[PDB]
């Protein structure tokens, strides 16, 4: 009747046509997401940076390159999971997306998660965090590492955004993130 591929494409087409928030006026290309539509684990960030915007792909910038390594160091191949963000359009001067802008785009993420139906989601960053606590304010630093019960029994593991490890290069910091990723993997349901 219908395939996951087709539904994601519909999401994709509606995004390219979206003008729901101010961010549509700035971006060069929308960044929907990429990966395995059958992964049991999804990674979600904040939004498009300069490279993402140019390639229309997620996490291709320096932060993305770093994320690739964290995944590799967690026994994970990019091609095996799915990667996306809370907002699809790049804000001017890469400023942080406004909560309003965040609220307007969210329905897309929801559909994506709906289509993939994963066992666990990793929230990279505070923005990714807000989305899973209903926009509410929460300190990424205080909650990182603690599993959150989300819809359909799915678990969300919040952790730091790769962008942070670009800034602070301490090994302790990298170890914590990896620890959090391992944590999420433990929630993937055994075969
Ligand atoms: S950021 Fe999202 S809600 Fe705003 S114009 Fe882009 S696709 Fe639409």
PDB file of N, CA, C and O and ligand atoms in Angstrom, residues 14-25 27 30 48 86-90 100-108, ligand 1:
ATOM      1  N   UNK A  14       6.887  18.425   1.589  1.00  0.00           N
ATOM      2  CA  UNK A  14       6.169  19.422   2.373  1.00  0.00           C
ATOM      3  C   UNK A  14       7.135  20.379   3.053  1.00  0.00           C
ATOM      4  O   UNK A  14       6.817  21.547   3.282  1.00  0.00           O
ATOM      5  N   UNK A  15       8.321  19.890   3.378  1.00  0.00           N
ATOM      6  CA  UNK A  15       9.299  20.745   4.015  1.00  0.00           C
ATOM      7  C   UNK A  15       9.831  21.764   3.018  1.00  0.00           C
ATOM      8  O   UNK A  15       9.927  22.950   3.322  1.00  0.00           O
ATOM      9  N   UNK A  16      10.172  21.309   1.822  1.00  0.00           N
ATOM     10  CA  UNK A  16      10.681  22.229   0.816  1.00  0.00           C
ATOM     11  C   UNK A  16       9.676  23.348   0.544  1.00  0.00           C
ATOM     12  O   UNK A  16      10.056  24.459   0.187  1.00  0.00           O
ATOM     13  N   UNK A  17       8.395  23.051   0.728  1.00  0.00           N
ATOM     14  CA  UNK A  17       7.334  24.018   0.485  1.00  0.00           C
ATOM     15  C   UNK A  17       6.913  24.765   1.729  1.00  0.00           C
ATOM     16  O   UNK A  17       6.111  25.693   1.650  1.00  0.00           O
ATOM     17  N   UNK A  18       7.433  24.363   2.883  1.00  0.00           N
ATOM     18  CA  UNK A  18       7.065  25.017   4.130  1.00  0.00           C
ATOM     19  C   UNK A  18       7.551  26.456   4.192  1.00  0.00           C
ATOM     20  O   UNK A  18       8.626  26.794   3.691  1.00  0.00           O
ATOM     21  N   UNK A  19       6.730  27.290   4.818  1.00  0.00           N
ATOM     22  CA  UNK A  19       7.007  28.705   5.014  1.00  0.00           C
ATOM     23  C   UNK A  19       6.399  29.042   6.369  1.00  0.00           C
ATOM     24  O   UNK A  19       6.103  30.201   6.663  1.00  0.00           O
ATOM     25  N   UNK A  20       6.220  28.016   7.190  1.00  0.00           N
ATOM     26  CA  UNK A  20       5.612  28.186   8.499  1.00  0.00           C
ATOM     27  C   UNK A  20       6.296  29.204   9.394  1.00  0.00           C
ATOM     28  O   UNK A  20       5.637  29.890  10.175  1.00  0.00           O
ATOM     29  N   UNK A  21       7.613  29.308   9.302  1.00  0.00           N
ATOM     30  CA  UNK A  21       8.293  30.265  10.149  1.00  0.00           C
ATOM     31  C   UNK A  21       9.272  31.117   9.363  1.00  0.00           C
ATOM     32  O   UNK A  21       9.542  30.848   8.196  1.00  0.00           O
ATOM     33  N   UNK A  22       9.805  32.167   9.992  1.00  0.00           N
ATOM     34  CA  UNK A  22      10.763  33.082   9.363  1.00  0.00           C
ATOM     35  C   UNK A  22      11.982  32.402   8.737  1.00  0.00           C
ATOM     36  O   UNK A  22      12.573  32.918   7.787  1.00  0.00           O
ATOM     37  N   UNK A  23      12.357  31.244   9.266  1.00  0.00           N
ATOM     38  CA  UNK A  23      13.525  30.538   8.763  1.00  0.00           C
ATOM     39  C   UNK A  23      13.491  30.126   7.293  1.00  0.00           C
ATOM     40  O   UNK A  23      14.533  29.826   6.712  1.00  0.00           O
ATOM     41  N   UNK A  24      12.317  30.117   6.678  1.00  0.00           N
ATOM     42  CA  UNK A  24      12.256  29.725   5.280  1.00  0.00           C
ATOM     43  C   UNK A  24      12.858  30.804   4.386  1.00  0.00           C
ATOM     44  O   UNK A  24      13.362  30.518   3.308  1.00  0.00           O
ATOM     45  N   UNK A  25      12.818  32.048   4.837  1.00  0.00           N
ATOM     46  CA  UNK A  25      13.341  33.145   4.040  1.00  0.00           C
ATOM     47  C   UNK A  25      14.869  33.175   3.946  1.00  0.00           C
ATOM     48  O   UNK A  25      15.432  33.745   3.006  1.00  0.00           O
ATOM     49  N   UNK A  27      17.294  30.123   4.635  1.00  0.00           N
ATOM     50  CA  UNK A  27      17.953  28.922   4.125  1.00  0.00           C
ATOM     51  C   UNK A  27      18.080  28.836   2.607  1.00  0.00           C
ATOM     52  O   UNK A  27      17.279  29.408   1.869  1.00  0.00           O
ATOM     53  N   UNK A  30      16.643  23.060   2.359  1.00  0.00           N
ATOM     54  CA  UNK A  30      16.132  22.492   3.602  1.00  0.00           C
ATOM     55  C   UNK A  30      16.970  21.241   3.886  1.00  0.00           C
ATOM     56  O   UNK A  30      17.491  20.615   2.956  1.00  0.00           O
ATOM     57  N   UNK A  48      20.362  23.137  10.881  1.00  0.00           N
ATOM     58  CA  UNK A  48      21.389  23.341   9.858  1.00  0.00           C
ATOM     59  C   UNK A  48      22.440  24.418  10.139  1.00  0.00           C
ATOM     60  O   UNK A  48      22.132  25.505  10.632  1.00  0.00           O
ATOM     61  N   UNK A  86      15.809  19.427  14.989  1.00  0.00           N
ATOM     62  CA  UNK A  86      14.508  19.965  15.379  1.00  0.00           C
ATOM     63  C   UNK A  86      13.961  20.905  14.304  1.00  0.00           C
ATOM     64  O   UNK A  86      12.760  20.919  14.047  1.00  0.00           O
ATOM     65  N   UNK A  87      14.840  21.694  13.686  1.00  0.00           N
ATOM     66  CA  UNK A  87      14.412  22.600  12.630  1.00  0.00           C
ATOM     67  C   UNK A  87      15.096  22.227  11.325  1.00  0.00           C
ATOM     68  O   UNK A  87      16.232  21.755  11.312  1.00  0.00           O
ATOM     69  N   UNK A  88      14.393  22.445  10.222  1.00  0.00           N
ATOM     70  CA  UNK A  88      14.921  22.091   8.918  1.00  0.00           C
ATOM     71  C   UNK A  88      15.638  23.202   8.156  1.00  0.00           C
ATOM     72  O   UNK A  88      16.404  22.918   7.231  1.00  0.00           O
ATOM     73  N   UNK A  89      15.405  24.453   8.547  1.00  0.00           N
ATOM     74  CA  UNK A  89      16.006  25.601   7.857  1.00  0.00           C
ATOM     75  C   UNK A  89      17.109  26.267   8.674  1.00  0.00           C
ATOM     76  O   UNK A  89      17.011  26.368   9.892  1.00  0.00           O
ATOM     77  N   UNK A  90      18.155  26.731   8.002  1.00  0.00           N
ATOM     78  CA  UNK A  90      19.255  27.383   8.694  1.00  0.00           C
ATOM     79  C   UNK A  90      18.912  28.829   9.069  1.00  0.00           C
ATOM     80  O   UNK A  90      18.467  29.619   8.230  1.00  0.00           O
ATOM     81  N   UNK A 100       9.817  29.675  19.167  1.00  0.00           N
ATOM     82  CA  UNK A 100       8.644  29.787  18.310  1.00  0.00           C
ATOM     83  C   UNK A 100       8.922  29.013  17.027  1.00  0.00           C
ATOM     84  O   UNK A 100       8.116  28.194  16.588  1.00  0.00           O
ATOM     85  N   UNK A 101      10.083  29.281  16.440  1.00  0.00           N
ATOM     86  CA  UNK A 101      10.515  28.610  15.225  1.00  0.00           C
ATOM     87  C   UNK A 101      10.606  27.106  15.514  1.00  0.00           C
ATOM     88  O   UNK A 101      10.244  26.267  14.676  1.00  0.00           O
ATOM     89  N   UNK A 102      11.070  26.779  16.719  1.00  0.00           N
ATOM     90  CA  UNK A 102      11.193  25.397  17.140  1.00  0.00           C
ATOM     91  C   UNK A 102       9.835  24.725  17.188  1.00  0.00           C
ATOM     92  O   UNK A 102       9.672  23.602  16.714  1.00  0.00           O
ATOM     93  N   UNK A 103       8.857  25.425  17.747  1.00  0.00           N
ATOM     94  CA  UNK A 103       7.509  24.884  17.870  1.00  0.00           C
ATOM     95  C   UNK A 103       6.852  24.635  16.520  1.00  0.00           C
ATOM     96  O   UNK A 103       6.174  23.626  16.320  1.00  0.00           O
ATOM     97  N   UNK A 104       7.067  25.555  15.589  1.00  0.00           N
ATOM     98  CA  UNK A 104       6.467  25.462  14.261  1.00  0.00           C
ATOM     99  C   UNK A 104       6.933  24.295  13.402  1.00  0.00           C
ATOM    100  O   UNK A 104       6.152  23.726  12.648  1.00  0.00           O
ATOM    101  N   UNK A 105       8.203  23.938  13.521  1.00  0.00           N
ATOM    102  CA  UNK A 105       8.777  22.875  12.707  1.00  0.00           C
ATOM    103  C   UNK A 105       8.619  21.476  13.293  1.00  0.00           C
ATOM    104  O   UNK A 105       8.555  20.493  12.559  1.00  0.00           O
ATOM    105  N   UNK A 106       8.553  21.403  14.618  1.00  0.00           N
ATOM    106  CA  UNK A 106       8.421  20.133  15.312  1.00  0.00           C
ATOM    107  C   UNK A 106       7.552  19.046  14.701  1.00  0.00           C
ATOM    108  O   UNK A 106       7.922  17.870  14.731  1.00  0.00           O
ATOM    109  N   UNK A 107       6.399  19.409  14.149  1.00  0.00           N
ATOM    110  CA  UNK A 107       5.516  18.405  13.568  1.00  0.00           C
ATOM    111  C   UNK A 107       6.222  17.528  12.526  1.00  0.00           C
ATOM    112  O   UNK A 107       5.868  16.364  12.339  1.00  0.00           O
ATOM    113  N   UNK A 108       7.237  18.074  11.862  1.00  0.00           N
ATOM    114  CA  UNK A 108       7.976  17.298  10.871  1.00  0.00           C
ATOM    115  C   UNK A 108       8.773  16.198  11.547  1.00  0.00           C
ATOM    116  O   UNK A 108       8.722  15.032  11.143  1.00  0.00           O
TER     117      UNK A 108
HETATM  118  S1  LIG B   1      12.321  25.857   9.844  1.00  0.00           S
HETATM  119 FE1  LIG B   1      10.690  24.317   9.592  1.00  0.00          FE
HETATM  120  S2  LIG B   1       8.754  25.457  10.074  1.00  0.00           S
HETATM  121 FE2  LIG B   1      10.337  26.966   9.565  1.00  0.00          FE
HETATM  122  S3  LIG B   1      10.186  27.374   7.297  1.00  0.00           S
HETATM  123 FE3  LIG B   1      11.721  25.757   7.659  1.00  0.00          FE
HETATM  124  S4  LIG B   1      10.624  23.784   7.370  1.00  0.00           S
HETATM  125 FE4  LIG B   1       9.132  25.432   7.851  1.00  0.00          FE
END
